[PDB]
RNA sequence: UUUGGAGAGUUUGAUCCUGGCUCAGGACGAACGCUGGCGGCGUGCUUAACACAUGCAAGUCGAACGGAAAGGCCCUUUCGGGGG
């Protein structure tokens, strides 16, 4: 079960003597919903070709979000190239706040509350590049605490690790209503 | 030890940056065009601190005093009125 979205098309032109040559690109987001997140930016010169490109490079390029249940960790200022994107765990329910691409990526990373928020660089491309750069900037409590060399709850809080302990609960549930 | 951040369009054969402009919401001591059944609730000179007809918007005590113009009572009557 592979998810998928298309946030633009753009026609592209190239001039030679005789006239004008055109062809189509695109750019694609896919992802599981599990943590799992591809971008994916192709050329054609047809539609069909274009977005095979993309769905195909997307499938080649993967990579692994740290989420810890519903919401992030900690906030996060990503910049990349001239984006800027900014990120910030949010409390359960209050669902996702975000731009058009910002919305896409992380619908199909799979979250469902999170606060973020574009503060230039508008275009889709550098957009989404921002985004994916503040989410591999994005570290893991447990290989933080490994790295430091000290016992887990010296280094986490008591919030943070009580929802982790309700979210290994719930998956449990889940995985042995599953079984069953 | 708790509460909460959305974008879109727009310069180029096509791309990016800065940056301008417009739109999606809420509010009025409001005005205008059209339409217009009823009940309940608040509100009604923001300009000329311009000029004003008119009718009202501050009186009460005889248990303070001198007194009885108009009333009541009792003495009188010619019904003009004479005393307490
Ligand atoms: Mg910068
Ligand atoms: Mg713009
Ligand atoms: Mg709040
Ligand atoms: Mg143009
Ligand atoms: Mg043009
Ligand atoms: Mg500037
Ligand atoms: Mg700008
Ligand atoms: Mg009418
Ligand atoms: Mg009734
Ligand atoms: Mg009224
Ligand atoms: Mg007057
Ligand atoms: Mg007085």
């Given at each position: 079960?592979?998810?998928?979205?298309?946030v633009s098309?753009?026609?592209?032109?190239?001039?030679?003597?005789?006239?004008?040559?055109?062809?189509?690109?695109?750019?694609?987001?896919?992802?599981?919903?599990?943590?799992?997140?591809?971008?994916?930016?192709?050329?054609?010169?047809?539609?069909?070709?274009?977005?095979?490109?993309?769905?195909?490079?997307?499938?080649?390029?993967?990579?692994?979000?740290?989420?810890?249940?519903?919401?992030?960790?900690?906030?996060?200022?990503?910049?990349?190239?001239?984006?800027?994107?900014?990120?910030?765990?949010?409390?359960?329910?209050?669902?996702?706040?975000?731009?058009?691409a910002?919305?896409?990526?992380?619908?199909?990373?799979?979250?469902?509350?999170?606060?973020?928020?574009?503060?230039?660089?508008?275009?889709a491309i550098?957009v989404?590049?921002?985004?994916?750069?503040?989410?591999?900037?994005?570290?893991?409590?447990?290989?933080?605490?490994?790295?430091?060399?000290?016992?887990?709850?010296?280094?986490?809080?008591?919030?943070?690790?009580?929802?982790?302990?309700?979210?290994?609960?719930?998956?449990?549930?889940?995985?042995?209503?599953?079984?069953?």
């Open positions: 079960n592979y998810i998928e979205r298309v098309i753009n026609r592209v032109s190239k001039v030679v003597k005789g006239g004008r040559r055109f062809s189509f690109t695109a750019l694609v987001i896919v992802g599981d919903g599990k943590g799992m997140v591809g971008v994916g930016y192709g050329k054609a010169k047809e539609v069909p070709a274009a977005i095979a490109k993309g769905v195909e490079e997307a499938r080649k390029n993967f990579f692994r979000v740290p989420l810890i249940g519903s919401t992030i960790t900690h906030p996060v200022q990503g910049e990349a190239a001239a984006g800027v994107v900014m990120l910030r765990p949010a409390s359960p329910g209050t669902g996702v706040i975000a731009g058009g910002a919305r896409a990526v992380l619908e199909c990373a799979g979250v469902h509350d999170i606060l973020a928020k574009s503060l230039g660089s508008d275009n550098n989404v590049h921002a985004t994916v750069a503040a989410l591999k900037l994005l570290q893991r409590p447990e290989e933080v605490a490994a790295r430091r060399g000290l016992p887990i709850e010296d280094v986490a809080p008591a919030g943070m690790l009580k929802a982790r302990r309700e979210s290994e609960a719930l998956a449990a549930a889940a995985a042995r209503e599953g079984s069953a």
